[model samples]
Structures are given as C-alpha cells and as structure tokens.
Target: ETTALVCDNGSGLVKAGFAGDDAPRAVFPSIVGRPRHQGVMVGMGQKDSYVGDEAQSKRGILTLKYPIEHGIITNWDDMEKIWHHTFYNELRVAPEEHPTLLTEAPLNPKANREKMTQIMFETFNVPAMYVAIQAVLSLYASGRTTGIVLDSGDGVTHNVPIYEGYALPHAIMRLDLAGRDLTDYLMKILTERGYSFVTTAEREIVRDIKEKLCYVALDFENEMATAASSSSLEKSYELPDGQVITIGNERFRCPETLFQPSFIGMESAGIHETTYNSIMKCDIDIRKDLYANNVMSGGTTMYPGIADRMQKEITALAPSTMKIKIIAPPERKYSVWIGGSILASLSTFQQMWITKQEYDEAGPSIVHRKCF
Candidate 1:
C-alpha cells in the first residue's frame, strides 16, 4: 500500500487516512476561517505554515466561521478556497498523478456534492478515488459488522448500522445535537448563569468548564439532587485562571453531556436514546438482536459514562432475555480513521480511485459512482 486517502467528511474533522497506516496522514478542522481585518494573512498552499488552535490568539483577526456547520459544508463561498488550500497544504500534492480517497457528506445534497467533486477534480486534478459513508467504512475494517455505529461529530449525530460489512439504511438516524451544538449551548448557559464567558478572555475558561465540570446524569432527579445538596468543589478541576466548579462523583469528574444533555435544557435523545434509535432503525428481526452486539464510537463516546450509559439504556429499552455486547473503539477518536486505513489497504480499492482521465470524462458523477 503506497498512498490512498480515505476521508470521512465529518462534522468534527475531515480525516484523510493514507493507504498503509492506522493513523490519519492528515486532518483539517472541517473549518476555514478568514480574519475580519484584511492584510492579516498571507498566501495559501504549502506556503510557510499555519498552526491549529493557536492561530486564534492573533491580534486584529476575526474567526469568520466554521465551514462545516452541523457537519456539512455551509460556508462554501467564503471558505471553499481556504478548505481546498488547507487540504493541499496538508497533502503536499500537485495536479499530477495524485491518487486520493476523499469522503463526502452522508446524503449530501446533489448540488453541494457536485460542487465538492468539481473542487477535487478541477483544483487538485485527483487522478484516483473511493468513497463511502465513514462509519460503514469503519465497520468494514473493524470486523464489527453486526453493531450500531454512533458518529457524534461536531455538526450532527449520525447513527449508522453495520450488519456484516454493509450498512442498514433503515437503521440510520441523524440528530441535530453534536459537539459544536453542545459547546454553543454551554457557552450560553454560562452567560445566563452570571458567568460572562466566551465574549471575553474567559472563553477558554468556559470551555475548560464544559470539558471538565459538565456531564450527563443517569437519574436526572437523583443527580440534580446530589448536585444541589453537595457543597464540594474538590471533584472539580482548576482552570488556568484559578476558577473551580464541582462535577459529581464520576471518575472523570467531568460533565458527560452525551447522556444527560438535559442538564442544558435539551429534551432530544441523549446518547442512549440515540443508540437505541440506531438499533431500532434496523429491520425488525435484526434490530431485536442488536444488543447482543453493540459497538460505541465517535468523539463523544469518550465521555466517561457514555459507553456504559449506552449499554445500560439499550438494555433497559430491549428485553431482559436479549443478550448484548457493547464495545467502543480502542481509541475512540481514531476508530473510523484506523478502520479507513484498513479499507485503503485492500488491493481492489485501488481500482475505485478516480483518475484525472476518468474525472475529465465522467465528471462529478464519478463521486456518486465511487461512493455508492
């Protein structure tokens, strides 16, 4: 395996996995920003250098928008070029015999999909390709074909099913709740709770609180009761600013938003309900046996109780006689990427790649064919 790119056009990040490796060869924020103040930046493409997260501190800079809103490309006009440039910079490629594996959004609108394909073909002249739903790709390589795939990325929650190397279309559920949604909601709560954060130097402070102190509660009533009764700040971690807040007794001691998102006034499905929905979305026969084989994944799956909570909730929802097996990715963050790595390693996948000739003849439909 030389080099093959596998992309999961995720809300969290665009993970590009090369042919031979378990780790991503390159990644981008799923975001492209432009500073409000002109003359603040330079050229793009393997230029000098651009750093992640740290760039936020530049003076007179405006972080325009995250190109991926709720996990799809929404800010195309303003950010498309930057995104392509970012990808190019990460890849260090030219318009030559560049074999690539790019990921597209799940159920991406035809027009947007066409536009993205054009970007790849016209800009980089990607001479080769293979595409699929990210989690399905994950299941194929991970050998967990009979389990539910929960992809909790920044923009949306996509619940996909894996039944022996194929996805169960009916078993898919997409939710609006995601990492960014959670972050935005938390920022607002801090504002309402007399903690003026996000609008000042305290933005990172607020994020620290969300990551460390916020959590999902199992019995909301009991958890709330405990939170209300306890005066202990010992369970909480201190921020750089010395501000501290108490989370409950969970070993992580952090707020687990995936299960108990209602702590933020949300009533939509938590991770458990979402997981259960994924199971239910399958055929009646197969779905009934979902619990016997469950696999948890995505960035949110790392939340302390989310994994156990998913198993618990699915169990409560399913029958007592039914058996289940729930397993999370060895490294939740890299689950899909590594799975992609495995897929790219296959010899036949080499045939699915889009050559510049095929791209010039077949055009964007290549993506549709390569993906489906």
Candidate 2:
C-alpha cells in the first residue's frame, strides 16, 4: 500500500508527519548549534549552551548554520548532518520507509531547488520525495483548495494563492516583515530597557515572551484599554547580581506597532495591508471564492485574537462589500505540513516524486522539475 509523509522545514520550526494525524509527528527548532571547543561561559562561571565559536564536527551537529536560509536552502554545509540527526532522533524513519513530501518557499529559486534535490538524494538516501511550498500546503488546514494566503513566519511573509495544489508565482508577494523581524525588535527593546543578557540568550527569551504574550490587537483601543487599564499587569524579573528588570504597559504598547505602525510612528507597512495586498493579487472571481475559503495556520496565525482581528482589520481597510473573512485552521500549527501528508497518501501523487532513478539522471536539478 502507498503511504505518505509530510515535512515542514520552515524558518520557525521543522515539523514532519503523515496523513490522518492531527499534527506533526516531529517538531524542533530549525537552528543547529553545538558547544565551542573553547566556549563562552554564563555568569557564575557555569557553562551552558553553545557559543558557536564556528568550530563544528560533521558528527557533533552543525554549529549555527540555519539549514533553510531565509526560508530556502542556501549557504548550506552541515545542514544535512544536523537535519538528518535531529530529524531521525525525533522521528521514526526506518531503513525502508515510505516516500516523503517536503515543504519549501513559494516560487523557490530554480538553482536552490536543484541544490535541495541533490541534498536529499546524496544525503538522506530516501526512496522517493516530492517538494511543495509551505503556503499552499497550509491551505489544507485553511480548508480551502484555492485562495490567497498570507503566510508570515520567521524570515518573510508570503502572499500566495493556491489552486488545485499549485501556487501561482505571478500573483505571489514576498516581504521582509515576519516573526523574526518582530522578535528582533522585541529583543532590542528589552536590551534597551537595561537588560545585560547576551545576544543568544536575549533572542530566545524574547521569542518565548512573544509566544507567551504578544498578539494582534483587534480593537486597538479596547486592546490598549486593557493593557493601559491600570489594573497593573506590570511585573519585574531578577537579573544576576541582585539586579532587577521591569516590564509594563510598554510591553503591550510596543508589539502594537505591528498593527498601527504610525502609532509609534516607525512607518513600516502593517500586516493588515500586507494581507490585503496579497489577497488582491488574485483574479476577481478566484479572489471572492478564496476569501470565502480563507484559512489561518502557522505559528504567527496563532497570535491571540489575531484570526478575527486579521479579518476585521484588513476588511476595514479594503473597499466596501469585498466581503472579506478569515476562517480558523483545524490545527493551526500543523496546517503548512498537513496537506502534503494528504497529497502524499494519494497513489497518483507519486508522479510528483523525484525517485532514485531521476536523482541519478537529473541530479539535484531534479528539485526544479519536482519543486519549482
């Protein structure tokens, strides 16, 4: 019997699973790092975490080389090793396993696709594989086979349209704003607020805070009203050497910049407009049907109150009677990788795979034919 597999190697996380499952069978940080031979030490002289002084063994895990650079593979080396180790350590890939389906960015560069194809065949030795972008695969969770998608993750935000499992490259939009930008901004603010933490530590902590508290404010006024309501959600943390840290209204105030940029006057384009612009790329009829089928998935989509807020905010800005709406993804976090699981399970979908025969003949460039 034909079986299926789905893998998401997104900037934010790597998730792998199969059809009929609620979500990913394996998920982990996309970052790969190992301790330096002569490593940086924490305060109190106790050593913890890798400093990635740029020394790495082919076996001990790649040090600080993000496998998927800016959402696609570039400048890769030990990625195969780290990815293989992390993936196998987490998932149950037996010697003779089912064919796999991998996710990539939309309209992924031809050269890059070739490189990925090469990596898979030469490195993992899989029996078969197929490549699809994260944006289109996510539509499965959105419960629509077609429509415009606004996918924001660690590196970039993609405005993509899906039709019958394929993404329209001409209509796609890519932007520099995403979770990484927001996280970096948050980390910088925390640093400016008098935290003396190291860069590595600061980044992770800020990301944790984002996951725990940051969200899209639907009703900007009422949203701020609660934060500024003076019930005092304010709090403090203790740093090393009896030092203390403080947080309060500024916490909620700053994240709001993602919504009302002029509120803080930074002049960055808001996600709402970005979402609309993405949706606008669709043809009029497809656009309407797609809107009706709109689905939300991925980590950023999980931002508290963001689903409805996205619809309300974007609709408020667009023309009258466009009838915009946002629907909830069944399992928001796994949406990007789940559809591929369904596609992979089909008997006909094998035509999409790059098999051992093709890898030998076409080489890594097979990724272009199979992926792009």
Candidate 3:
C-alpha cells in the first residue's frame, strides 16, 4: 500500500519520512554544496554536488548555499537538489508512487505557493500533495484544534494564532529574533569581553555554543544578581583545537534577547508579548482557549528553560483571571515534522491532498482551492 510522504522544510533543516513513521527518516540542513575542486570541474562541463555530511565535512573548502531563508525558498535549484536527494537517496522512495504532505511558512507569498505546487507536480511527479502551513501542522502535534503557536526557527520567529485548524493570517506576529540572531549576538558579547578567537569560529561552531551554553532565564535580573554574587557562574568550553574559553552571563543573557529585544539594540516586544498581543487581536471569546493551548515549536524554542520562562513571563504580564498553558514537547525542534506525520497518517487526510488528476486539469492554481 502506497503511503504519504511527510516533509517539513524549515529555514535551517529539512525533514522527510513516510507517513506512519514516528520521526523523520531523513533529516539534514536545508543547504546544498559543491566542493572547490568540483567548482573548477563544473567550469570544465561537469555538474555534481554534495549534501548533508559530505558537504558539511568540506566546510571551509566548499562554498555552501542555503536554499531556504526565513522559511521561504530563495534558491529553487538548491531546494530541488535537497528534496531530490531526500526522496531518492535518503528515504529510498519513488516520488511518483507516494503522495506528499509538505509544511509551509505563514504569510508565504502567492507566487511562492504556486512555484512550490509546480515543482512537486511537474518535477517530482508525485501522485498527490498537500501543503499545510507550519503553524497549523504544529498544532497537530498536540492534537489541538485551537491555540496560539509560537514558532521560533533559526532565522525567524512567528506567533501565529490558530483557530479550528486554520491560522489567523492578519494577527500573525513575525520577528527577526531567532537562533542565528542569538548566536551572532552571543558572538558579539563574547568578543566585547576580550575573547579574540570567537570571531573566527564557523557558523556551526557558534550554533553549537548557543545550543550547549545558552538558555532562557526565568528571571533575568535575579539571575544576573545570583551570577554576580557567586563564583562568576562561568562555564568552561574547549574548542575543537583544544582552546578553552570562559562563558558566564553571556549564557543566559544571549538567549534573553528573545524575550528582550532591547538587549540587542532592537526596540520591539519579545516573544511572549507578541503571543499575548496576537491573542488579543483575535475575538475575545477564544482568547482563553488560545492561552490555554499555547504551543511552542521550531529549533530555537528548544533552548533550556524556554518553556518555563515563557509561561512565567507571559503569565506575569497577562490578566490574573486568565490561565495560561504553554506546551513544549521534548521534540519541539521537530514538532512540525511530527505534526505532518500525524496528519499524513490519518485516513481522512487524503481527501485534502490534491490528486494527479486535479493538477493536470487546473494547473498550479489548484493549490489555492485544494490545499488551503
């Protein structure tokens, strides 16, 4: 029996698996790379590329290009390479035999949607397909039909309100505060503190530091005070070259930028306030439900103490009468993929997918009517 292929393509990573799998069978960066040697050979009339581990190992040796930026595909050529490898080499699946369920970004442009539909039908020749916004699919992770989704990825963060399985297009909140921003901010903070070598570290190195050391403070001021009184609260991190570095308040402070944009010279409300404001923009009657089922997704939201800190911070600012519940799954980083898995597995879900016959008759425009 042929099954749906679930794909969650994010700004930083792309995850794809058969519908019934508990997790993605293939997960890798949303990037495509060719070696320096291959670059010269391409000029000599040969075309080939390396992806994931192969490309990752080349690092400084190869020029890498990310296909997705801010959750939108910026390079279709690279995107096709990634997805083609995902379906053919990684998952070992025949694209023509399987139906596909893909996750999309909120406020994605009409042209982008049409282009995506064209690629799957025209290029991959999939039997059927459906494109669900990432926010709505994330809600499926918890089986919730209504909630406020706080999706914080590597390049962008958005607070999207979902009601009865559909996202509220107008009230959506998008922010530039995310993993890369935090990493760059941390790098700056470390540099100002007399750390000279941090400037040369690769993007992955910076990301590793942020992931392993950075965290959301339940109370920023109190944490700073505690660190000040204690033995510096510094943690020792040894780089790949055996160079040791000292990290202290920069740990919590860097991640704190998500909650306090002013920390990084940006004037804007943080993730929590954005969520509250999004709910406020919605009809008041559903505000309680929205607060009750606050769901967190994306790679950035997986930071230590993020869920507790967000719940504590937002709850403090919200009305006393309101009850807030923030759901942060252990697999929050892959929550979008998990949701697609759940959705694609459902018997009723296939009715939503656009079939081959539909694509042949109405072309890419059918995505607007069938998938939405």
Candidate 4:
C-alpha cells in the first residue's frame, strides 16, 4: 500500500511525513549549509553540503543559506536539495512511489506554483501531487470550512478569511512582523540591559528565550506597570555559558509588539486590527462567522494568552451585539501539516490528486485550476 506524503514548508521550518500520521516524522529548519573550506579536499569522500539539523549543528564551519524567505521559495536549487534530503535522508522513501501533498503560502505567485509542480512531477517523478494553501489547510485542521485564519510564523503573519474551504484572496492581510521580529526585539531589549547576543548562534538563543519566557499581555499597560513595580512577572534563563539572566518587563514587552506594532516602530496595524480589517473586507454576511471561528495557527501564535488578547481587542472594535471568539489549537504550530495529512488520507481526496498522466497531457499550468 502506498501512503501519501505530506510536506509543509514554512519560512522557518519544514515538516514532512507520511500522511495519516499524527505528526511529521521530520521537522527541521529550512536552511542549507556548505563547508567554507572546500578547497582542502584532503579526505577521499568529504561531504560538501548539509541540510536541516546537520546544517544547523555545523554552523561554525559551514556558511548557512535559507532556501525559503517570507514563506516562498527563493532558491530553487537549494530548495530541491532540501526536498531531496527530506525524501532520502529523513523519510527514507522513494519519491516516485508516494503521492505528495505540499502547502503554499497565501498570495503565492502563479509562476512559483507552476515551477513547483514541474519539479515535483518531472524531477521527483511522483505518482500524484496536490498543492494547498496554508490558511485553508489550517482551517481544515480546526474542523471548520468557514473561518478566519490568523497564521503567524517565523517570517511573516497572515490573517486570511476563508469561506466554505475557499480562501477569500481579497480579504487576506499580510504582516511583515512575526516571530523573528519579536526575537530581534527581545535581543534589542536585552542588549539595552547590558546583555550581548550579537552572533547568529546567539540569535537562536534569544529566540529560545523569547519562546520560553515571553507571553502576550491581556492588558498591556497594566502588565507593564505591574512588571515594573514588582518582580512577579520576572523569569530567569540560564544561557549556554551558565550565566543566569533575569527577564523582567522584557518578557511581556517583547510579545507585546504583536498586539501593538507601534511598540516596535512599525506603522502597520496590530494583529487584532488586521484580523478585524480582513473580516471587514469580506461580505457582510460572513463577518460574524469569521469572527466566531477566528482560528490561530503557526509558531508565533503559541504565546500564552494571545487568543484571549485577540478576543479582547477585537471585541472592543466589533459591534457589542456581535459575539467574538478565537480558536487556539493545542497543536497549532503543526496545524498546516496536520491538515494536509488529514486531507490526503481521505478516500474522497484520493480522487483529487493530479496524476502524472494528467500532468503529461495538461502541463504545469493545470495546478492553478486544480489546486485553487
């Protein structure tokens, strides 16, 4: 029996596994690295390049490169190598034997999608394939066909409104600030407090601090004042060097940027405002449903009290008569991959895959017609 493969490629991480599994078999950073000294080929069989965990582990000796940027593939050659690694090194499966389901970002260019289809079919020689929008898949993960998906990953944030399993393209809102930006903000604050995190590896440590210590403030001003007056909100983190640092107001202040972009000097509206604006862009009838089923996905949404803060802020802007709710899944960080897994495993979805025969007849352009 040939089980389908589900692959969710985000700007920060790549999740890949066989469909019907509860979680991905391989989850790694979307980065590639090559040794700095390839000229010293003294060894008979030296590995020149590495992907995922190995690439990350050998960061000091290797020059790292990100294959994806802002949720889109920027380097095709590097991306192909990453995919090749996923199938052979990670999954240990023959690409040709499994039907593949891949997730794409909102507002992805048609050319990019076509190129992906061509590569998957021609290069990998897959039996069948399907490309899906990350937002719609996240909605499916929540068991809803109509809702608003607020997906914020490491690279970017998107508030996409979906209706009956279809994303409303016009209503989608994109934000440049995301988890990485928050990490930077945290690093900046720590720097002001006499802590140094200047190196690339240090940045990863800062990110870990942000993820572990930071949390959304339901009431920003109150939390700030409370944190300032007392050490109640302070959390301690021990660095790799065994230096213990007390993270006080910065813990809440860092993630506060998501609720108030102005805190980071960004002119764009906050996530709640963006979500409200996105819903407003849709038809008046669907606004209520969108508000009611406001779903959260991606790593950035893992911060505690984020859903409550969103609900509180959006409720303040929306009509008092209307009810507002935000759905935060326990496994939201892998929702896109889980959604693809669920969809691909269904018998009905089996008929939806674009087979190699169809691609040979219709070409890569068929992806647009079939996927969307």
- For the record, the alpha-carbon RMSD of candidate 2 to the native fold, in angstroms, is 5.2
* lDDT for each candidate structure: 0.60, 0.64, 0.80, 0.85
lDDT of 1: 0.60
* TM-score to native of every candidate shown: 0.82, 0.81, 0.91, 0.93
Query: What is candidate 2's CA lDDT for residue 113?
Result: 61
Write the residue-wise lDDT of candidate 1 on 1-372 in tens digits. 346666566665566646667677666554344444335445433222223332334412445345666646776663455445545566555534445555543655667666767766676666665555666655655576677777776676777777765667665777767776666666665554355555423544555555655555555556655655656522656756577644344322233555656655577767678777777667777775566666655666656556566666677877788666677766877776777777677877667666668777776776766546
Ranking by TM-score: 4, 3, 1, 2
What range of 10 consecutive residues in model 2 has the weakest lDDT sum?
Answer: 50-59
By lDDT rank, best first, the candidates go 4, 3, 2, 1
Please give, for residues 1-372, the per-residue lDDT of candidate 3 as tens digits: 467888777788878888877778888876577656435443665445877656766666666777777767888878888888888889998988888888788777788888888899889999888988888778888778888889998878899888885667789988878876787787788887687534222666777788787777888889999887656678888877688788888889888888889978877899988988888899877777888888899998888898898889888888988678888878888888888888888888768778879888787788876545
lDDT of 2 at 184: 64
Kindly report which residue pairs in candidate 3 clash with one another: none
Error of 4 at 361 (Å): 2.9
- Residue 105 error for model 4, in Å? 0.6
